Symmetry: C3
Subunit: 278 residues, 3 copies
């Protein structure tokens, strides 16, 4: 549904950090259902979120968030003991706020935007081991009136991989011509990257959408990103270009050649993609 | 000419891909007149552009564009047989659109901006060979009312080179104090860069120009870029700083040291340049 | 106060380039009081600045500035002999200008912004030696109406160091909850970086501050930077998150692991910091 809503609710949520069978580490809302990337958390400006977090691993782990109003006790770092011991359980709290005028007359930003969460404790004091292994996930904070998508996809460039997948695999995403597709794009690790989508483009601002003819933001289909960068956008699938198997990839030449490639499969109403072999 | 116009007309155009005597590969509007970078293509929002493309090389080649409304048949990739056989000829179509309100009440962006075209098939499935050899070129799409420059210069950071030129060989550009100079800045290859100009600055938005006093865009003279990034801007030559041999270079220290340097030569009305 | 008063006044200043005892090279306002980074230079749009520069070193050195209206005679490059001989003295001139309509009806940008000065001559004709040794410093140009901070801190990512300091040695900065803190963020050298601040966020525009509700600039807490990049922002210390030892670091994993970390120490009114022992 378009736009909405007001926002300002208290939200409760359970979350777990698990070591997976393949040696990777992931977050999940349920035990045995962890994923890389971790599950999407979407809230509205003003919402308070209480996360009952449980470390089911044999090493210390934490939950650390970007952009959201988290107190030092919910920082998720080793230094101030806001990380979690093996088998332990801690309640992290993320608050959010609406924009508005301060007493001094200046404008307070508001927490709306495309954010992410990750471990800060596994491997090193900066979560190098955790992030490498897959302990990361997307967070979206919505402002009142923000356009809502048909579906949201998370693309994370972690080191030389997309979503910790083996080279030249996925992820591939499906859509029908006209679908409002939202992309959350996060980067992690050592390397700078350049995200690129074939046949689609977005505004380089907060939402990825231009508000009106007054917005001077650059319209792009290619964007440089570094570790811990997060941005997002919405596109109309196949808008002005029609159905097809539209590539997305890192445009760093050796990166794309070594398998940092996926497909945005845009289908006709009848379900066919020209000219693609399933 | 300053400002405008509307669009869009239907444009027809011929383009060729050639192996050069250097060993490099270039695009051109005519056989024997290929260049690195390839020729500039400038259109207005709304224009439809039909390119009669001919691959004169012994390997498969393609034409792939950023930003413009090109259908999957004009994607220029091997994956869906959109590339071209040796000796072959294919018609690529690029469409452009004005911004406007969608039926749902949201705002559709529009094609206007600084874009680029390149090969997607030579060397690898991603045109690593073609791009390295020089198969790249600039594309400008104008919005109705966009300020038009006196001249347009294309600077491409390809790997450790500028426009595939040997270290410490420019290119250099000339202008007179007061000339409205447009720069199209494209990056290709493996490495990140920082584009920098002495004595000049621009807005970090679509046009490179601030619309008015309400535009909050950062005014910059230094910008980080990665492979396939493209941006552009207009500057008034020598504005507030006067004539001179103004350096432009990548600011990555070893890059500038190893030859990623050129000169923006701004002359007095009499033709002289202070210093130099 | 609160806001910038508008220039332009003619300002005179003395500056020295010294080789320090430890082997580093620094700028200073007084002979013997050189620092890395060099001293902050803050002016208002319209101001003219005359810098009486003296090279006290045994090699050639220069003063080169970003963003400000400097003539070719004040470029500070070997090319046009605007660098300074050992023991020599040269008067550099930096001018600034307000935005306005040109004769042709277009809008001229104006000098306002976060800028930097550095050497262009030591080591190579691009100042690679000087910059590595520490010859760099911040420059701020204010526009009329610009919100003034309580304090300004300079964070320079020079190669694998912050402000040429040894790994894991800060620098740390102190503030009290509610203080308007300004950060000037400059990058130099060979490497790309990602600047990140725990518990704080800013707008990705000229001032780092949103003008009003109409500003579409992305609100971020993480930003990719390359050599010679400069940006700045203002934050309300501990806003929405309270006091604490808030971490700042380059988010490139090996960089933070190898010492590119510091602390933004936000104190309670009573001077205590939760979960932090001194
Ligand atoms: Cu951190
Ligand atoms: Cu990459
Ligand atoms: Cu492409
Ligand atoms: Cu982080
Ligand atoms: Cu591609
Ligand atoms: Cu470079
Ligand atoms: Cu410079
Ligand atoms: Cu491309
Ligand atoms: Cu320079
Ligand atoms: Cu770094
Ligand atoms: Cu963090
Ligand atoms: Cu510089
Ligand atoms: O972090
Ligand atoms: O591409
Ligand atoms: O520079």
């Amino acid at each position: 549904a378009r736009t909405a809503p007001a926002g300002g609710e208290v939200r409760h949520l359970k979350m777990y950090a698990e070591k997976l069978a393949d040696g990777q580490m992931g977050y999940g809302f349920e035990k045995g259902k962890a994923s890389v990337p971790g599950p999407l958390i979407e809230v509205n400006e003003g919402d308070t979120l209480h996360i009952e977090f449980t470390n089911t691993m044999d090493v210390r782990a934490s939950l650390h968030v970007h952009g959201l109003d988290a107190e030092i006790s919910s920082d998720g770092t080793a230094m101030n003991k806001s990380d979690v011991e093996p088998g332990g359980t801690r309640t992290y709290t993320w608050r959010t706020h609406k924009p508005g005028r301060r007493d001094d007359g200046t404008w307070r930003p508001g927490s709306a935007g495309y954010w992410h969460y990750h471990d800060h404790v596994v491997g090193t004091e900066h979560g190098t081991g955790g992030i490498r292994n897959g302990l990361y996930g997307p967070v979206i904070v919505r402002r009142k009136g923000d356009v809502l998508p048909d579906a949201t996809h998370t693309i994370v460039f972690n080191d030389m991989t997309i979503n910790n997948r083996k080279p030249h695999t996925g992820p591939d995403f499906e859509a029908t011509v006209g679908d409002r597709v939202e992309i959350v794009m996060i980067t992690h690790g050592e390397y700078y990257h350049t995200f690129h989508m074939h046949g689609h483009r977005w505004a380089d601002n907060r939402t990825g959408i231009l508000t009106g003819p007054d917005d001077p933001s650059r319209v792009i289909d290619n964007k440089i990103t570094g570790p811990a960068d997060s941005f997002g956008f919405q596109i109309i699938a196949g808008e002005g270009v029609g159905a097809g198997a539209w590539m997305y990839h890192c445009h760093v030449q050796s990166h794309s050649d070594m398998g940092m490639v996926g497909l945005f499969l845009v289908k006709k109403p009848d379900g066919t993609i020209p000219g693609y072999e399933p």
